Amino acid sequence: SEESQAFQRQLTALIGYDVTDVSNVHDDELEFTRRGLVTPRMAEVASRDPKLYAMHPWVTSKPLPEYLWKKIANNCIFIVIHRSTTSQTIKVSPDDTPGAILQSFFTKMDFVLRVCGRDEYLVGETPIKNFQWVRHCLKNGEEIHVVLDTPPDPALDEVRKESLWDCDRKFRVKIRGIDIPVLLTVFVEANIQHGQQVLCQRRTSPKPFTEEVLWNVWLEFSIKIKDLPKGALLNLQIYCVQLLYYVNLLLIDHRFLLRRGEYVLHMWQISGFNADKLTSATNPDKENSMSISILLDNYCHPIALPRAEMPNQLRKQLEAIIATDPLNPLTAEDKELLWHFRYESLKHPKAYPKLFSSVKWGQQEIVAKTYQLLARREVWDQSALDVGLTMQLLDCNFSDENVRAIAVQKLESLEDDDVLHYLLQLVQAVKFEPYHDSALARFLLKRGLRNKRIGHFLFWFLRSEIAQSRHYQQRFAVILEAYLRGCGTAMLHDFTQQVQVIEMLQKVTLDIKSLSSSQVISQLKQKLENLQNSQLPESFRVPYDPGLKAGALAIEKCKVMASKKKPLWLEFKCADPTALSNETIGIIFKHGDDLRQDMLILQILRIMESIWETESLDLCLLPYGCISTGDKIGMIEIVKDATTIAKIQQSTVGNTGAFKDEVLNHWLKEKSPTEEKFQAAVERFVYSCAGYCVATFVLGIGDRHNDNIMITETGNLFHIDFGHILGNYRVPFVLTPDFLFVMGTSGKKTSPHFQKFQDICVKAYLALRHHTNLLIILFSMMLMTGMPQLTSKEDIEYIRDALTVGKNEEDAKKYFLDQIEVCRDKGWTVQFNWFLHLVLG
Numbered sequence: 001s002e003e004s005q006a007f008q009r010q011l012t013a014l015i016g017y018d019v020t021d022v023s024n025v026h027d028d029e030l031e032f033t034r035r036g037l038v039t040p041r042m043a044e045v046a047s048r049d050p051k052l053y054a055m056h057p058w059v060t061s062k063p064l065p066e067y068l069w070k071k072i073a074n075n076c077i078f079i080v081i082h083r084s085t086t087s088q089t090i091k092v093s094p095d096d097t098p099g100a101i102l103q104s105f106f107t108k109m110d111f112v113l114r115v116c117g118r119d120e121y122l123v124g125e126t127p128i129k130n131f132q133w134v135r136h137c138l139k140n141g142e143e144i145h146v147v148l149d150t151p152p153d154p155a156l157d158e159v160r161k162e163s164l165w166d167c168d169r170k171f172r173v174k175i176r177g178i179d180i181p182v183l184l185t186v187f188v189e190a191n192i193q194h195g196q197q198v199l200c201q202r203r204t205s206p207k208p209f210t211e212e213v214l215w216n217v218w219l220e221f222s223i224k225i226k227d228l229p230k231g232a233l234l235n236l237q238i239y240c241v242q243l244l245y246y247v248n249l250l251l252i253d254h255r256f257l258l259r260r261g262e263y264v265l266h267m268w269q270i271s272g273f274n275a276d277k278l279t280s281a282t283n284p285d286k287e288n289s290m291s292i293s294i295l296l297d298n299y300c301h302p303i304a305l306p307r308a309e310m311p312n313q314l315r316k317q318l319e320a321i322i323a324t325d326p327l328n329p330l331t332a333e334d335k336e337l338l339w340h341f342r343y344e345s346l347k348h349p350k351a352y353p354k355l356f357s358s359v360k361w362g363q364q365e366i367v368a369k370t371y372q373l374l375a376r377r378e379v380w381d382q383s384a385l386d387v388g389l390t391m392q393l394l395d396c397n398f399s400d401e402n403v404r405a406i407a408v409q410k411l412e413s414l415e416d417d418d419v420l421h422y423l424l425q426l427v428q429a430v431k432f433e434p435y436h437d438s439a440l441a442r443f444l445l446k447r448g449l450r451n452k453r454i455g456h457f458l459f460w461f462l463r464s465e466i467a468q469s470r471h472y473q474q475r476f477a478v479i480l481e482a483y484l485r486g487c488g489t490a491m492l493h494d495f496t497q498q499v500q501v502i503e504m505l506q507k508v509t510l511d512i513k514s515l516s517s518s519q520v521i522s523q524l525k526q527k528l529e530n531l532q533n534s535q536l537p538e539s540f541r542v543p544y545d546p547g548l549k550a551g552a553l554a555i556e557k558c559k560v561m562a563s564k565k566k567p568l569w570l571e572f573k574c575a576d577p578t579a580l581s582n583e584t585i586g587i588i589f590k591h592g593d594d595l596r597q598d599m600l601i602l603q604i605l606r607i608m609e610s611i612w613e614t615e616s617l618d619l620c621l622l623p624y625g626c627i628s629t630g631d632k633i634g635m636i637e638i639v640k641d642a643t644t645i646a647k648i649q650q651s652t653v654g655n656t657g658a659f660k661d662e663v664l665n666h667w668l669k670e671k672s673p674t675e676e677k678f679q680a681a682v683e684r685f686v687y688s689c690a691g692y693c694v695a696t697f698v699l700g701i702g703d704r705h706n707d708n709i710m711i712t713e714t715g716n717l718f719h720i721d722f723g724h725i726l727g728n729y730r731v732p733f734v735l736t737p738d739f740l741f742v743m744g745t746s747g748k749k750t751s752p753h754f755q756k757f758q759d760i761c762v763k764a765y766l767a768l769r770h771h772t773n774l775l776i777i778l779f780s781m782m783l784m785t786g787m788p789q790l791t792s793k794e795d796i797e798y799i800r801d802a803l804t805v806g807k808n809e810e811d812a813k814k815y816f817l818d819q820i821e822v823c824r825d826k827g828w829t830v831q832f833n834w835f836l837h838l839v840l841g
């Protein structure tokens with residue numbers, strides 16, 4: 001079929017990698033997974049409601065918060081229905097269904113209610129208070145604008161036509177030798193690993209370091225063939241003592257067969273603990289990489305793989321073990337305790353990650369007992385889903401499919417709003433899966449095909465990894481292709497325009513970067529005008545905001561910015577004529593910063609805002625849109641009406657460390673029309689400042705430069721450029737005299753706003769502390785999947801101190817107030833030093 005072959009070249013263009021390309025494979029796992037996923041894909045496409053899928057209603061089950069309830073008139077919401085040039089406002093009870101909001105339009109004085117200017121529809125049996133746009137409208141005090149129109153054709157989402165246990169011998173590997181085409185002493189270290197657990201360790205004799213070093217040794221391991229668990233790795237490492245190269249091979253394949261034969265595995269080098277050290281993929285660059293030659297006995301061959309009481313002090317020992325943070329290491333005593341009292345540990349879902357890390361995986365009867373333990377899962381299965389507990393079972397410490405599957409089972413019960421909250425980190429969690437085909441990969445795939453919004457983000461999350469990870473590109477490319485073959489031609493067409501546009505805008509960014517002024521300013525418009533001609537589509541969906549349709553460029557407004565990395569400031573017209581405003585879509589296109597790092601941080605800010613929403617706290621964070629498109633390249637959402645803290649100083653001062661305290665509050669009044677607005681801008685400042693002080697403190701990205709703190713003309717403060725301190729790594733946070741001056745404090749003093757501040761801080765900080773485990777795991781996972789070199793295990797443990805684990809609320813309240821005071825003690829010291837360092841040298 002030729003129309004099927006041309007379609008593969010389109011998929012290959014959308015993916016950014018050729019999924020058929022067999023040059024970098026040593027087995028059919030990727031083919032077996034491409035084939036393996038055909039069923040979940042066909043089962044979700046067939047099960048989905050075409051109408052609900054066509055319109056992707058964005059709904060939450062969460063109770064409407066208090067701060068949103070108080071903003072109500074009196075059990076009444078004002079919805080402004082539009083049409084052509086007619087606009088009739090209707091009073092509607094928060095509990096009112098959008099179907100009845102038509103019955104209160106066709107009887108009060110077939111057709112769908114779409115938001116004005118957005119591809120966002122208010123459909124299905126859900127109270128309007130439960131729509132995410134509605135809740136967004138209440139928060140920002142915006143008006144609920146709806147334009148009545150026709151439901152999209154669900155025929156546009158049309159999808160195109162489609163024994164190991166009996167051999168008691170000790171395991172062995174023959175290390176033939178290693179070869180590097182260019183250029184000491186050298187040894188091969190072979191390890192039998194099961195999720196961070198090293199079952200056995202062998203080494204070769206140190207030979208001289210030459211372009212070809214041979215051994216012909218049979219390395220015998222202490223573990224028997226029968227004791228090998230499904231998920232075990234053979235980790236090959238080259239030392240010279242300094243590690244230089246690594247490669248991994250799964251011992252038991254995707255078919256449950258033990259590994260036999262000859263393998264020439266090309267090796268991954270070491271640059272400069274992370275997820276890339278765990279890859280089953282081989283280095284694609286053959287011409288320059290080091291390879292290892294090995295043999296595994298191709299024998300016959302096919303070897304396939306198939307309560308009482310407790311003393312007070314022991315129970316008190318177990319309880320103190322179970323109620324410990326995810327990062328506290330377990331000692332051999334703790335592990336022996338947990339395992340002996342395993343049936344008692346099962347009644348405590350919180351214990352599962354610690355109980356499963358007590359299992360000796362290099363022992364078959366032990367692993368068999370662990371399966372008996374999982375058949376008595378009841379408590380876990382019954383319990384109210386805990387994400388932080390679920391994620392602990394998806395980390396690098398778990399290599400058993402069955403242990404991992406119980407966490408994926410817990411995720412099935414997540415509503416879409418929640419899937420979107422944890423999507424970026426569930427996608428990064430795929431890097432920890434022993435096999436390409438997993439319960440997690442299938443989960444991600446089902447959810448994306450079931451919802452266009454999860455699907456839009458899945459695509460960019462996966463695309464970003466395929467574009468910049470050689471260790472994971474193959475695995476991700478197989479999940480992307482599986483998604484793209486079940487989303488619809490409408491989605492396929494959407495993704496097409498987006499890729500086409502973003503790929504053009506990346507060329508522009510890099511060409512402009514090369515020339516580094518009057519000369520450059522010209523080239524900008526010169527290049528942008530050629531694109532707007534015909535090749536570039538009329539409009540395109542915004543990758544960080546799928547609800548928006550970005551039309552033609554505002555060439556006039558578009559500019560190259562004054563920075564080391566020369567970024568593009570682009571402006572786009574809203575392609576939707578139903579838009580209640582002529583406000584542009586501002587996007588920054590940048591090369592230099594690692595936007596992967598920003599994304600991970602931005603997503604943690606969203607989770608922190610959600611932890612605050614559950615405890616009636618709105619800390620006014622601005623976690624702006626950010627989509628990494630490739631290596632050190634991607635896009636940033638422009639936050640409107642915003643300046644940097646440094647430029648505000650540069651205004652009433654001028655390119656010096658002479659930092660005036662008066663400056664901020666001045667600019668705030670200068671940019672406020674009424675004093676009612678100024679009071680609210682100060683109210684926003686106090687709230688946003690506490691939020692970034694706490695968040696920044698917890699994440700440990702607190703010591704920042706003024707140039708990386710932004711403020712809106714409406715008082716909202718926000719941090720920018722996270723992939724800069726994390727890109728290349730004192731005060732706990734930025735709480736400068738200009739910030740304290742806005743709060744009504746000069747030197748060591750107190751005011752009604754500074755007391756307001758400290759109370760919000762302590763409330764916010766104690767709210768995050770109730771989610772210790774969750775924040776720890778996320779932080780730990782972000783460091784492993786997204787942070788290069790910033791690992792060690794010690795960088796991870798920073799979060800324990802910040803979250804003040806082990807301490808009580810009163811002691812925690814005390815600890816945060818100290819930090820607030822070290823900010824007052826330092827004043828402008830750190831800022832002036834940052835200016836000295838960054839601006840000068």
Ligand SMILES: Cc1nc(N)nc2c1nc(-c1cn[nH]c1)c(=O)n2C(C)C
Binds near residue numbers: 598624637642
């Ligand atoms: C969210 C955001 N908004 C605005 N108005 N400007 C930004 C920005 N974000 C970044 C940024 C975020 N990560 N890296 C840069 C940025 O540099 N700027 C300017 C100073 C041009």
